[PDB]
Amino acid sequence: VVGGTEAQRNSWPSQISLQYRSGSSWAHTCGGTLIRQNWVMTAAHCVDRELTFRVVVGEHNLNQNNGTEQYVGVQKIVVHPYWNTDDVAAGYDIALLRLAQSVTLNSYVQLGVLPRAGTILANNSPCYITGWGLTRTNGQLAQTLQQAYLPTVDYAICSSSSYWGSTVKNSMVCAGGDGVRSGCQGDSGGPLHCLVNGQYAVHGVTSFVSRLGCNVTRKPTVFTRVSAYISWINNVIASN
Template sequence: MASLQVNGSHNCGGFLIRKDFVMTAAHCDGDRVVLGTHNLHKSGKTVRHIVKRYRYPGYDGVGNGKDIMLLKLSREVQLGNSMRLAKIPRSAINIKDNEQCRVAGWGYTRTGGWTEDNLRVVDVSIINQQVCRSRWGRLPANIICAGGYGTNKGFCQGDSGGPLVCSGIAV
């Protein structure tokens, strides 16, 4: 996991896909990335500045899809126990309705809350596309709905850009 920060404060999540690249959401802003820690205020973390942003071609606002961005880090990080690369799919994969996946982040734990110092992880299930569209209306074609049925656990403000991990793969 990575914390995308603005002036030393957590703004969005992200995840390491190469020693020098973090993937996040295109709508996220920040001037540095913090890696290798569960607690953002403890020592032992790795800090890298962002030298280049690569937004997905055609990105035109968070509500229109294609909300993905690569961040080129100022230098490579050292991989080890506290820092590993996320597995990403090499080709299209099929995610099933109700499949159990996982999200993580330092975002709010309730609406109107505040960001957390400690990384939180929660299991979520994939929501059927038709159910999702009937509940939230028009959604971009490439969206994955997750959260679950009958639960209030999931992701919130500040968790944007973090991965949805299904069967060990960031999808």
């Protein structure tokens, strides 16, 4: 997250850190949202690599013991059948991870609230992106969870020539684009929390940013629109 602020320890309990085994240790690669005690929602591009993944819930500082973490292996990965690694702009950048064990819920580990199917946010709706992603374009991961206020940019505007053009689809949510705040590498797969009817719900799964940089004016961060996949999500969980 570029241009973010450090999140409070218990502000985003559904946020998870998806890590892969690197040598004798683990490395954070993406974010995700805990949606069931044994299911995590993340981006499909996060799991394209044939790596060994683990999920960490109740995480705050990637480099120090917080006394609230729970580590669990990923038992099964279900990527959306229409996902094409060579075409992120086509959409379907979503995957569900079934955890080897069901995590324990508490103040630091909670299920993310998903929006009602088909829900579309009005332009400039209040949302926060959270993650441990790069704090600057071509920079380094944050040590502590970051959050950045990123108001949505509706489809009409986001798909205009000045913005993303045909690159963005209606199956996506755009947010930010002010040139200062944005998601960045390492935030992928994480949540876009938007306040609706007094309750924050996860409306987006961080998908992509501009090849020119993370915080680029008129190139808002693009997320997979969760409300477009409610049936798919329910179908996967019910069948696994």
